[PDB]
Each structure stands twice: as structure tokens, then as C-alpha cells.
Amino acid sequence: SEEQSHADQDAYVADVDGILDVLRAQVLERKPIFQFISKSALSLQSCDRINCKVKDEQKSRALTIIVFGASGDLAKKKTFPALFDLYCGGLLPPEVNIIGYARTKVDDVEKWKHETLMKYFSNLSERGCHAEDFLKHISYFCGAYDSVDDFKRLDAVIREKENAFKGPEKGGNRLFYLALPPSVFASVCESIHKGAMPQEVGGWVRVIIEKPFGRDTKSSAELSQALEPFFDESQLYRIDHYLGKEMVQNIITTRFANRIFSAVWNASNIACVQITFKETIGTEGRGGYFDSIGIIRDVMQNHLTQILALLAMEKPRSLDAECIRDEKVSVLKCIEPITKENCVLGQYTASADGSIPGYLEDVTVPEGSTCPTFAVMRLNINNDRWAGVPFILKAGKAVEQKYVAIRIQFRDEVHPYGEATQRNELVIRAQPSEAMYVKITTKVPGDLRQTHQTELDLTRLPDAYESLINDALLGNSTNFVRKDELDVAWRIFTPLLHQIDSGEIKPIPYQAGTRGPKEADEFIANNGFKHQ
Amino acid sequence: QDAYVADVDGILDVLRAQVLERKPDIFQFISKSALSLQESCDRINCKVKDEQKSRALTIIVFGASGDLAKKKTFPALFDLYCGGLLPPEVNIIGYARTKVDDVEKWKHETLMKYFSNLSERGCHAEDFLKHISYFCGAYDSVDDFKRLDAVIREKENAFKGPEKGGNRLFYLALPPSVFASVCESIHKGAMPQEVGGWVRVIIEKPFGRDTKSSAELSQALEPFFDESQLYRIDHYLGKEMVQNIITTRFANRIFSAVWNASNIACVQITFKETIGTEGRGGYFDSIGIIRDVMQNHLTQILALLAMEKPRSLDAECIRDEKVSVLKCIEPITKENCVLGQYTASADGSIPGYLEDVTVPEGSTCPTFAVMRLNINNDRWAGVPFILKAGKAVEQKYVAIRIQFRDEVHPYGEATQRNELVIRAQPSEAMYVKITTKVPGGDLRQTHQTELDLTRLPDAYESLINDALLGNSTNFVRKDELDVAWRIFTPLLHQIDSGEIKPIPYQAGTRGPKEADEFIANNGFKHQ
Amino acid sequence: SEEQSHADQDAYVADVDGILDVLRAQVLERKPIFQFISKSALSLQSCDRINCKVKDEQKSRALTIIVFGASGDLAKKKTFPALFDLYCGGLLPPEVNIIGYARTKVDDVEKWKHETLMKYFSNLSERGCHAEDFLKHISYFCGAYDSVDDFKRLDAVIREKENAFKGPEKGGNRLFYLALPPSVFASVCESIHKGAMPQEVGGWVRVIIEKPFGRDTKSSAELSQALEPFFDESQLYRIDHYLGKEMVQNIITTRFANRIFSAVWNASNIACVQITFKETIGTEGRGGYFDSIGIIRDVMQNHLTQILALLAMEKPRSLDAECIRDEKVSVLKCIEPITKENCVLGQYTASADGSIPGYLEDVTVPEGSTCPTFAVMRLNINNDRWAGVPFILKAGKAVEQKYVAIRIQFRDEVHPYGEATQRNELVIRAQPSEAMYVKITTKVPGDLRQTHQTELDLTRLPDAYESLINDALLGNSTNFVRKDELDVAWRIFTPLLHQIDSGEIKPIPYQAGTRGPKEADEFIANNGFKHQ
Ligand SMILES: O=P(O)(O)OC[C@H]1O[C@@H](O)[C@H](O)[C@@H](O)[C@@H]1O
């Protein structure tokens, strides 16, 4: 009935207009909204004191957070606004001292805090009735990144605040945030070691370092060696801003707490696994900085490999941090170096709109650039769980949608259902919002062959970046890459990166705002994935 | 045209079954095996297929003045009619012994007063009554069926449609003792016209009382009607629950991979009723709970639940698999059985089993049983299967409960056992119990969540529907019935010899406390 | 890996469904079948004139076959259909005369042939285009079994056909088939001798007699003495319908033509030998006839003892018939009378189904009957080849399967393999079809202790009964029990039979359709057999 299909479509619209009309009538009566509609449909189917949530140990002692490169883009646009959100969420100790350390003088600290920091503070009414109070916890310090007497001067500014601490324990804990280019990480850590470690009477030292952590096996190991005489792996926190705690729980708990999910989490049942990181934005005039890095070092060797490890690891001995990281390392050691045959690159050109100019139209990009802005590749995990299972990492700038997800596709059951069924999927999406769902086939209510695909959903708290800083403050290093883990990761990628810098794989042009090169989607279809 | 293929993969099915049974070179065995084979008032929306409205259909309900016919079968055909699942010009004949002078009064008094008075349906009663005639006859007189034939053949030629002849559905709403006689009488006296039409026969329980008495009845009927024609109906099995069982498992890798001993800790199939048996001792006392619902009804659900993967969804493949799995079940023993018999309710409103003039004093008949079955094959060895059925207990509940092995590491007490529930009564539900994260901390912060897995014809109606459509999937086959009786007959005899005796339980309680102890001692855990 | 075992089972099914799908696709293309599937799998792993096959001597002279008791169940259901199969197979001379001799008048011979004979003719299209032609070779004759003038009348009917013979030699050969109760065998053979021997000008006389041949030593010897003044042992053929030529070749040739098999065919290497005859049917309302016989006289003293002789005999001087029978006799003389200690009896009760009513529920069975319907027993052959080797005969009605086999179990090699090996077996099965196979242990492809049990197979032609009649027509008496052989056989069994009729061993009840009494399988385990 092609006549009835057309009449059903119109009837579904008019039936949706009928529902909405009722919901309209009642909303005109009561007149309170987004909440009210919710209940009526199911039926006949802020500026309050920060409630502190910090633990007893955290309020027991002075805390100082030192943000180096405090006037830099990362610090002012990302670190400081995160600290504010933690402040508002009640996740910093009440008396916390925040020091912005920069190389550049400032005549007016107060103007610096308003005009350079508070501008990037979330303006959400629930916050921004607390901005002024947070600014009172922030101080500016001006010094060099290589000069010990500066770090002593700094140490004496910090001691002054530690010693005024109006609570039980003595000394103070110090979190050093290195929002800096890697080239000065060694001199700062040393400066810190020589001049500004916590008082002997007590307190810990932790250091967060930002990417990049090398550019290949050799440069990465060097930077590790350069840091390790000053900070061991309990103190050093290499941050990947994108790794959300919520996603990490979705990966770990759904699987390891449930027999249904742990039993199918293997080669006997999974057809392909894809980890996807997509952005609509381009390199945004930072093309020249990106041109030295590329999409592979930018997000794949660090962020996606960290998601891969958690996804593919064997069951840890406990849910303790270092047991989880032991498994990440174990699984990565089973992965072969990626081959150029198993990689498809792209470089974006102007969007249809012009709103994203082409990569090579950025004047800071040098003529002849073969820098990949898109890459899909397959990794092989050789162990009993995973041998022969395709793992595809895919990352892209200037593509069709902003999107971060894990897609596991299970093998089809050809008999008995055949075309009346379809590969099951588990999807863990982090962006553009959280969802985790399985797609299975079920009966339709009213012949056995009559089936339906149905999504079963399985699922202001801190955002990804905020949860990581908080974790650093509590001493939880689960979601930070460990020195051994880093090296192994670099060994998976370094030969491919070398073959790319040697010119043996060229990026395929693609219009900004499309899915990327056509060859990439074909590559995915040729390595285990089946559509609809 | 098509009967080549129906033969071809009819052949592949035999090769299929042979290879899985010997477990060989797969190739060399296939070759070998081939060589050696030489208030709204909803109006009626027609949901019927092309084939069903292309030929006359007649439905003859034998025993039409019996309580079964008048209170269940006619009302159910009425509900199908309203649901638009009978062809427009369907012919229904009510066949009985008693002479009826006033046939239209009969339809009012005997039949229509049992049709649902529900507001949506009320309007169609009189219109459905048009499609029904009475017929007066015996169940063995050859001339009574010649006459029936002629009454039937009139209506078949008054049908204006593409196909000649008429399909005939014979509904034996009769005591089992007359089935053979009626079936022979149909065979010689009223088969469909050779020009065209199928014949199908629906028979009602009991299907014997043991292996011997059940095999006797199959042997009496098998000269007149084969397994494609004969439908042994189980009132209680519904289309919707069978689909939840087969589809949710077999369509899906995630469920198919855990449907086995390595992942499942125990399986319970439960049939609970609040009602008792008052004034039904004539039927019930010689039958008891095991024969009444467990040997027939619960065992079909078991077989569907436990069967190996069928090659296709064709009726007889599924039914081949039911048989294969039932044949791996050991006869139930007296040690794997707890029996009950209900006494008067605590509040005294409800009489006990024995308090009934239709029940002989000192009766031993169970109104309640829990039993453990063992399926000895690769998929199921060691897994406890518990069947539970009880009359006059605390609630009306029919469900399958599958409990999966716990993952003790690494979540420990922050997890428990996954479960899958398929529920049919008092309302349909299907869901899994899993543990997910709660946001706000430690990995060990978790929650138990129930994931839901997504006027219609009822259970009985959906089986009549399937009989009309020629789909025998949900009907116990002859061989299947034999194997089921062999599971239960030695126990049933051990019971009639009083090796095992029923424990009393007040009506309205859960049943004998020993039953819940049995279940916990057979692998179930209730946290 | 209990997880992988479950995943392997499912993978083997889905892999078998994949194979079958391909075989399905190709069969939908060509569309010719049972033959086509055969080749495709290995790959990328009738009404025509009777072709006469009769020898020159057989067509040289008239043949007449006289079936006495021609309207009896044996004749009409078994003898006549066999003759038809021989006819179709081209193994009767073209001009053969078949005479049905019965005691009972018949108004219409033609109706007799259609309604009483042809009904039991195989309806296989390849045959039944020849039925009418065969009926033209059959005549009915009505006479007494004791009256000489009847046999003269018969002789003159036969001469009429012999004398019309349109080929070289004169007279005619006469095969007399006595499908009769034994009580009239003497009077018929005498009647034959006095009245209907072949013409002097030429032709042989042969007589097939049906069982029983006595019921003990004494009655059997008497019947032998009663027959021997009329027919010597070159003319008298005592038929055992079950002894197939194919099985006899399997026993004789596999062993005596091969050094590998002859070398192990002895006490040094064989642990136990079992000869099994199993039926699913009951006594089938003939319970009263069976009640006078029992399973021991019915099938064990005749049929199984004949299989035993061929199995256990020393190498014959030649493969000539009388040399083979000389050895059968030799070996049977080494066998001790069976003892009641070495026998377990059974009597079947109703099947679970009712489809086989109990033995004692047959109204022709007299109350109190102790007639065995099942028996297992051990025989001891005392000679250099066999001393100490258990030989178990087992026969059963109303058991679990229809099955006839020889099972030889060889001693285990405990060292060095131990549990990684298992007793070798040679199996010669006749029913429900022919197979001969040895079970040995071999390596598995991919440690020395890793072993597999493997069956090596070593292996419309006439059926068993047909081959025997044909043999009678050719003068081959190999597979017929000889007078001396019979007597020796009876002496092995007569004391046991006497101890049974004297009530010193009672049958154990067993449900029809089970394996038989539990004590019997234990008896087999206590006399040399080891399972799996
Ligand atoms: O209502 P549904 O889901 O169609 O099924 C009806 C159910 O009714 C119950 O009473 C039966 O015990 C079930 O076996 C049956 O499935």
C-alpha cells in the first residue's frame, strides 16, 4: 500500500500536531514550561554559599596551585576557568592559594585578574556570583623559568601563605601546573626541585605537564629522562584534557561489572572497534603551529590510544589507579607498529561557505605542506582477546560534525534471521554529549521475521578537564599516561610518522565540512565495518 | 515452481542435522552422506493476507454447546473477528448433538452472552452472529458428516473469489475420548473438495496422562491427519512471549553468546495463579499440576528457551530443535521435586483443595510443584532449570528468569548478578538487570538498572490465528510430545505410588517453605 | 578455556551453516541433487530388459524350483519375493519353471499370483516392470505332503515342462524348497524320493529345509537320520536366512588375505569377541509360537554359532565349500558346553510407548512363561588360538536398536601411552547396514601424548536371503550348516537349554526399547569388555 504509506505519514504529522495542541492548552492554563511539558506528556500517554565537598585530608593542610605561563592562552582560557568551576563546585579546599606565574611584568594585578582571567569565566548566573571571591584566592607572580633565585622568591611568597594556614597540619601541598611549551619543562622542574619544593615539616609536590610529550620515541624518552631525577611517577601528571572520567567509567564499569558485557568483549564476538574524534573547526590561523605536529601526534598517539588501552585491556587486579595503568601498558605492548598500508590521510580545503578557509590558504602554513588534518588507520592487537579484530582510530579537523564516540560492532548472526537482523552495536559517545547505548534487534508487537532495530539507553557536574585537575588534587593518576605507557605508545606510531615525513603517504584533499576523503570511508568498509 | 527448493534445503536440513550429530572432514562427510541418500468503538481493520481472502474458509467447532466451546472458543473467534483476523466472508459452524428448534435463540443464549461486552467490541456481536450456523449431529454417524459436507459445500460455492473450493478448520472442542471417531468421520465424510483447500484439525488437552496413553491417541489419529494438519493447542502459550524468547536470543550476538553454561547460573520458569480449582476436581484430581501445566506448557517454553540454533525460522526447523533439546533431558527424579497441596486461606474466605465435592477425600493430588530439570549437552551441562507451577498462591505471575554468573572481580560488592526477565502475566515485560556507573567519583560507585527491551489478540486467540495461517511453530509435535511424556512419566508414577507426598500450604501464601529452600539450594540468589 | 569451548561450538555450527549456504546457492543455479552436492563439497574442500548373468551350465538344462507351503507366510512374504529379485537381477535361467505346491485348493491361480504373491513384490520402479513376466514362470500345484501319487502327478507336471526345454541338455534340475513345519520334512523328502526325483537322462536334486532343525541334540540327530536315506549332504541345504555372503567375505577375506589381520587373530592379542543380534520388534502376537522356542534356539544355536565358527576357525586348506565347512566343524568341537553361570536371560515387558505390548500380555503366551526374549552368554573355545578369550553371543528382541555386528576388542597397550590410548577394535556390522572398520589411535596434527581415536573404513545387489538361494542354485554349500556341524552345535547348547527348561535360570524383566537387563551389560563388563 503506497497510498496508505503516504496517508500514514500525513496522519503521523497531524497526530503529532494534536498532542502538541493539548500540551499547549494546559501550558496556557497553569503557565509556570520545559519541566511541565515533561510530566503532562508522560501523563495519559541561584547564588548560594559554596557547599564544600572536599575530604578531611584536603582541608587538613594548606594547598597552593601554581600555574606557570599564567598569561598564556591555555592558562587564561582553560586552566583558570576550570579552577573557577572547581571552586564553585566546592572541590577546592576553602583556603586555597592560586599563584599565576608568568615571565612578563604586570603593573596592575587587579586589572590582570579582571581583564585577562575573569573574561573567560563562565557567565552562568549560578556562577559569577562567586567570581570576585575566587579572584581573592589568585595572586600574580613574575619571574624567569630558568633562574633559581626566582623560585626561592616564589617559595617565600608561598611559605608566607602556608604559615598563615588556620587549620591542623603544618607546611603545605603544592600543585605545579606547567601550562608551557615543552622546551622549558626541564628547567622549570629543576628550578622547582632546587628552589620551591614543599616545606620539610610536610606537604606533597605534584606537577601537571601539558602536551606534546615528545614527537617520536627518541624525543619522548629524552624528555622523560630529563624529568625523572626531579619527579617520579607518583608526582608527575601528563594531562590529556579530553579524557573524561564519565567516559572512563562507561568503558570500565559497563564491561567489567557485568557478565553479559565481559563475555562478548573479545574476538569471538566483535567484528570491529572504532574510536572517532571529529571536529568542525579548522586550524584557525594556528596552521603554522599545527603544521609541525599533524593530526596523528595531535590527538591519535595520545588521546585515542589512551581510550584504546582502557577499551582493550585485560581485567585489572583491582580498580586501584596503578593496577589500571599496569593493564593499559600490558595491552599496548601487544600492538604492532602501524603500517603505511593501514593509514589514509587527508588535508582539508575551503568549506563550501568560506567560513573555514583551506589549510594551505593560511599564510603561516609553508607552501608544499603535506601535514595531515585527517587520518584513519587500523591497529592490530595481537593477544588471545583481540587477534584479528580491526581497531580503527579516526580523527579529523574541519569535518561534518563535532563528535567523539566509541563504536563496537559485533558479528552478525546470519542464521536463522538473515536479513531480518543486523549487527549489534555498542556505542559510547562523549561528544557532543554523553550517551551509551546498544542497538539490538527485537520483535515487533502484533511473524517471527518481523523485526525492529531498537536502541537501549544504558545512560552542573565537572567537565572532562575539570575532573582531571580534581583527580590530580586527590592523587588519582588513572587517567594520566605513565612513562612506560608513553614510550610504548610512541613505538606504535613512530615508524608511520617517519614514513609520512619521508613523503611515502600524501594527504587526500577534502572540502572542509564533508566527512573527509572518500578513500577513508572505503578503508573502514574494507576493514570490518558494515553499514546499516 | 517452488517445490524444488522446499525439497533442496529440505535435503540440506538432513545434512545439517547429520553433521551436527556426528561432528566429523566436514566436506568428506557431506559427500559421504549425499552418496548414501539415493468508550471508543474501534471498527474492524482487515489484517488478513491475500491468500486468506482468496478461497472459502469454514470453521467447524465440534462440541459447540460444551463449556469450552461456548465460553472460550466462540468468544475467542469473536475477538479475532473484531481484530480483523478472520476473512470477511468466514463461515462458522457450531456442531453438537442436541436438537435445536430455535437456532437464532441458541446463538443469543449459548454464545453471545459469553462474548466480551467491552465497549470497543460490543457493536460487532450481532454482525458476527451472522457468520454462525448451528448443526445437529453425532460424532460417528457417516450420514451426519455427509450432510455436514453438503451444508459446508453450499457456503463454499456461494463464495465469490479467485480460488475454487474451501479451506476447512475442524475445532475439536470435545472430550479426548471422541477425537479418533470424529477424525475418522471427517476423513471419510467431509475433507475439503479435491479442487482445492487445506484441512486442519485443532485438538484440546489432555493429550494423554502418560507416555503410553498419549502415544495411543497419537496412533489413533495418525492414519487420518499428519503433523502439518494436526494442531494440539495450548491455551496459555502466547505469540508475544515466544517471540521474546526466539528473537531476543537468536537475532542478536550479544544474547546468543551468553546463552550457555559458561555464563548462566540458573533459569526459572514460573507459572503462578491466585485462583484455585473449586468445582474442577473432575478435570483436575486425576491430572494434577504437573500434567496440567508443566509437562505441556512449561516444557514447551523450556524447549524454546534451551534449543540449539535452527537453520531457518520455518516452523518445522524450530520444532526439530525443540525435539533435539528435550531429548537431552534426563527423566525427573523424586529427589528433584517438591510437591504442595493447598488448604483454606488464613482469613478463611477461600476453601482448601480437599474441601470440594468434586474432589475425593484424602486426595494426594498436587496443586503446586517445583522441580529441577537437568539438560545434559554441551550448552547446558550443570545448569539448573527450575520449573515452578502453583495454584492458589500469592500472585498471578508467569515469567522466565535467567540469572547470569556474577563477576566477583574486580567490583565485588559494587556489582551483583545480571538477570534477564521475560514476563507474560499479569502484564508483558522484558528487561535485563545490569550494573552501571553513577556520576558524581570512585570507579566503585555503581547502580542497578533495569533496561527495558521494548485491542490485540490474546494468547489463545494468537494460537487460533496461527492455525488459520498454517504456522505450527507453537504447537507440540507428535515426537516432541512423546519425549516430554518420557521426561515426566516415571516421576508421575513415583508420585501415584506415594514415594513423594504433597506438603500443605494455606491458599494465598507463596506455597511450601521447602519449595523456596529447594530453589536457593539449586543455584538461585536473591539480592 | 571454558569460554572458548562454548565459542568454538557456536563457531562450528555457524561454519556448517556457511558451507551449506554455498552448496545451496550452486544447487539453485544448476538445479539437476544428492549426486551434485557430493562433488561440489569435495570440490574446494528404469525398466530395461533383464541382462542375464547366469553361467553356461545353468542355461544348458531345464531348471524347476518347487516351493512347498507356497501359500504360507514364509513363502509368500519371503521366498517368492526373493525369487523375483533373483529374476530381476538376471540370476535365474531364462526358462525357469517355478511351482507353488500347497495343501489347499485355489479356484483362481491368476488371482492367487496377483493377490497372494505379487503384493509382497518390491514395488521399486526398477522392479515391478518385470512382475507380470515373472508371474508367467509361476504355477500353482495342489496336493498332500505325504501321498506318493500326488508327487507323481507333480513329477508329470514337471516333466511336461522339462521336455519342452528349448536348449542343449535333457531332463532337468529340480530345487525343492521346503517352506514347511519340520514335522512334515521327512514325509515330503520321502515322497520326493519315491515319486519326483529328476529324470534319469539327467539333472540334480537339491532340497532347502527351513529351521528349526531339532530343539536339542537328540531331536536334531533324529531329523538328520530321517532325511539322510533320501538326500546326502551335497543335496541337503539347511538355510539360515540371516547369513549374508557379504558378511562372510568380510570375515574370511579381511583376515586370511592379509598378514596384518591374520597375525593378531588370536589369544595373544584379542581381549574379547562379541557377536550381537538385536531387534526392535517383539514377538508380535506370535508369542505362543516363540514360547516353545526361545531366543537361544531361535537365533543363537543356529545363526550366531555359524558366525562364530567362521570367525574362530583355523585357515582352511582351500576356499572350496567343503574345506570351509570342515574348519567350522573343527572349531566348534573345541567349544565347551555353555554353563548356566555363563548365561543371563531377559524377558521384555511393555515399551514406554505401548507400541510393543509386554511378552506376557500376549494371550497366546501361557501364564507363568519363563521364555527368554533376550540372552547374553559366554562361550570358551579351548584351542591354541583362543584359549582364555571371551566369546560373547548376545541376542535380543524388543531392545533399543535393530543391529547385527561382530565386535573384536584387542588388548590395550598400557605402556607407553597409558590413558592417551585405548583398546583397538575391529567391527563387522551387517545391520542396519554394511560397515567394517578398525578403531586405532593416531597422532593429532600440530606433543606425543596428544592422540585421537579414528575409524578407518575398510569398506541393487542381492540381499542376504537372496544370495543363499542363488548359492543353492550354483551348488555352493559354504554358508549352510552341515549335518556334523549341526550335531556339534547342539551339544554346545543342549545342557544350558535343559537347565533353563528345568527352571534353574529365570529371565530378568526389561522394558521393551531399552538395552535389556542391567545384569547383562555388567556380565559383558565382567567377561573382558572395556568401554571407551
Ligand atoms: O501475552 P503474551 O506475551 O502473548 O503470552 C501469553 C502468555 O500467557 C501465560 O499465561 C503463559 O504461561 C505464557 O507461556 C504465554 O506466553
A442 touches chain B (CB under 8 A): yes
| CB proximity list for B72: less than 8 A, separation 6 or greater | B235, B460
Q: Is the CB of B387 under 6 A from ligand 1?
A: no
Q: Is the CB of B240 under 6 A from ligand 1?
A: yes
Between CA B388 and CA B394 the distance in angstroms is 14
What is the end-to-end Cα distance of chain B in Å, rounded? 59
A262 touches chain C (CB under 8 A): no
Q: Is the CB of B426 under 6 A from ligand 1?
A: no
Q: How distant is the alpha carbon of residue C396 from its chain centre?
A: 15
Are the CB atoms for C436 and C457 separated by under 8 Å?
yes
**E strands within B405-489?**
419-425, 429-437, 446-452
Are the CB atoms for A340 and A330 separated by under 8 Å?
no
For C296, left (φ over 0), alpha (ψ -120 to 50), or beta? alpha
Distances B259 to A15, A261, B266, B387 between C-alpha atoms, Å: 41, 13, 11, 18
What single-letter amino acid sits at B93? I
Of B12, B212, B256, the CB nearest to C354: B212
Of B244, B258, B410, the CB nearest to A315: B410
Place of cell 498471578: B396
SS3 A387: coil
Helix (H) or strand (E) holding A270: strand A270-278
Selected residue of B18, B35, B262 to mutate for chain C interface (largest C Cβ count, 10 A)? B262
CB atoms within 10 A of CB A463: 15
Q: Which of C303, C415, C498, C531 is catalytic?
A: C303
Residue in A236, A240, A220 with CA at minimum distance from that of residue A228 = A236
Phi, psi of C65 (to 5 degrees): -110, 120
What single-letter amino acid sits at B36? S
What is the end-to-end Cα distance of chain A in Å, rounded? 25
Place of cell 501359500: C71
Between CA A477 and CA C105 the distance in angstroms is 109
Print burial letters for A13-52: b (CB count within 10 Å at least 16), e (below 16): eeeeeeeeeeeeeeeeeeeeeeeeeeebeeeeeeeeebee
Between CA A232 and CA A484 the distance in angstroms is 12
Contacts with A, C 10-39, CB within 8 Å = 11, 14, 17-18, 21
What single-letter amino acid sits at C150? D
Between CA B71 and CA B89 the distance in angstroms is 23
Chain breaks in chain A (C to N over 2.5 A) after: 32, 45, 446, 459
Between CA A110 and CA A139 the distance in angstroms is 9
C317 touches chain B (CB under 8 A): no
Place of cell 520483535: A443
Between CA A214 and CA A225 the distance in angstroms is 12
* Peptide bond before residue A495 is cis, with ω within 30 degrees of 0: no
Residue in A172, A405, A170, A171 with CA at minimum distance from that of residue A278 = A405
Strand order from edge to edge, sheet including B56-62? B132-136, B91-96, B56-62, B166-172, B199-203, B230-232
**Max Cα-Cα span within chain B:** 84
Cα dihedral sign, B378-B379-B383-B388? negative
- Cell numbers for C415: 605402556
Between CA C305 and CA C395 the distance in angstroms is 12
What single-letter amino acid sits at A236? L
Pairing of strands C391-396, C374-379: antiparallel
Between CA A292 and CA A434 the distance in angstroms is 32
Pairing of strands B419-425, B337-343: unpaired
Are the CB atoms for A412 and B306 separated by under 8 Å?
no
Q: What share of chain A is helix, strand, coil (3-state, %, to 5)?
A: 40, 20, 40
Partner-chain contact B30 C12, CB within 8 Å: no
Distances A151 to A146, A159, A192, A209, B26 between C-alpha atoms, Å: 9, 12, 6, 18, 77
Q: Is A2 exposed, middle or buried (0-12, 13-18, 19+ CB in 10 A)?
A: exposed
What single-letter amino acid sits at A318? S
Pairing of strands A403-410, A270-278: antiparallel
Between CA B203 and CA B181 the distance in angstroms is 13
Between CA C70 and CA C77 the distance in angstroms is 10
Residues of B in contact with A452 (CB under 8 A): 454
How far does residue B308's CA lie from ligand 1's centre (Å)? 22
| CB proximity list for A110: less than 8 A, separation 6 or greater | none
- Cell numbers for C80: 517368492
Partner-chain contact A415 C14, CB within 8 Å: yes
Helix-helix angle C305-312:C483-501, to 10 degrees = 130
What is the end-to-end Cα distance of chain C in Å, rounded? 25
Phi, psi of A8 (to 5 degrees): -70, -45
Between CA C6 and CA B262 the distance in angstroms is 7
Residue in A115, A32, A119 with CA at minimum distance from that of residue A84 = A119
**B484: which strand partners?**
none
Between CA A452 and CA A446 the distance in angstroms is 12
Strand order from edge to edge, sheet including C205-209? C138-142, C97-102, C63-68, C173-178, C205-209, C236-238
Helix-helix angle C245-256:C305-312, to 10 degrees = 20
Chain breaks in chain B (C to N over 2.5 A) after: 24, 38, 440, 454
Between CA A348 and CA A295 the distance in angstroms is 12
Helix-helix angle C483-501:C321-332, to 10 degrees = 30
Partner-chain contact A268 C17, CB within 8 Å: no
Method: X-ray
For chain B, the C-alpha Rg in angstroms (whole number) is 25
Print burial letters for C423-462: b (CB count within 10 Å at least 16), e (below 16): bbbbbbbbbeeeebbbbbbeeeeeeeeebeeeeeeeeeeb
**Best of B205, B237, B292 to mutate for ligand 1, by most ligand atoms within 8 A of CB?**
B237
Q: Is C386 exposed, middle or buried (0-12, 13-18, 19+ CB in 10 A)?
A: buried
**E strands within C263-373?**
270-278, 343-349
Between CA A63 and CA A177 the distance in angstroms is 13
Helix (H) or strand (E) holding C522: helix C518-525
**E strands within A444-522?**
451-457, 508-511
Pairing of strands C391-396, A508-511: unpaired
Distances B327 to B207, B299, B371, B510 between C-alpha atoms, Å: 19, 12, 18, 32
Print burial letters for C45-67: b (CB count within 10 Å at least 16), e (below 16): eeeeebeeebeeebbebbbbbbb
Partner-chain contact C4 A268, CB within 8 Å: yes
- Cell numbers for A338: 602501524
Are the CB atoms for B249 and B259 separated by under 8 Å?
yes
Q: How distant is the alpha carbon of residue B54 from its chain centre?
A: 29
Between CA C290 and CA C288 the distance in angstroms is 5
**C381: which strand partners?**
C335
Distances B500 to A372, B276, B493, C318 between C-alpha atoms, Å: 79, 22, 10, 69
Between CA A474 and CA A237 the distance in angstroms is 12
Q: Give catalytic status of residue A303 as yes or no.
A: yes
**Best of B240, B391, B395, B475 to mutate for ligand 1, by most ligand atoms within 8 A of CB?**
B240
Query: Any idea how long chain B is?
Result: 527
**B92: which strand partners?**
B59, B132
**B446: which strand partners?**
B437
Helix (H) or strand (E) holding C205: strand C205-209
Between CA C407 and CA C409 the distance in angstroms is 6
Q: Is the CB of B459 under 6 A from ligand 1?
A: yes
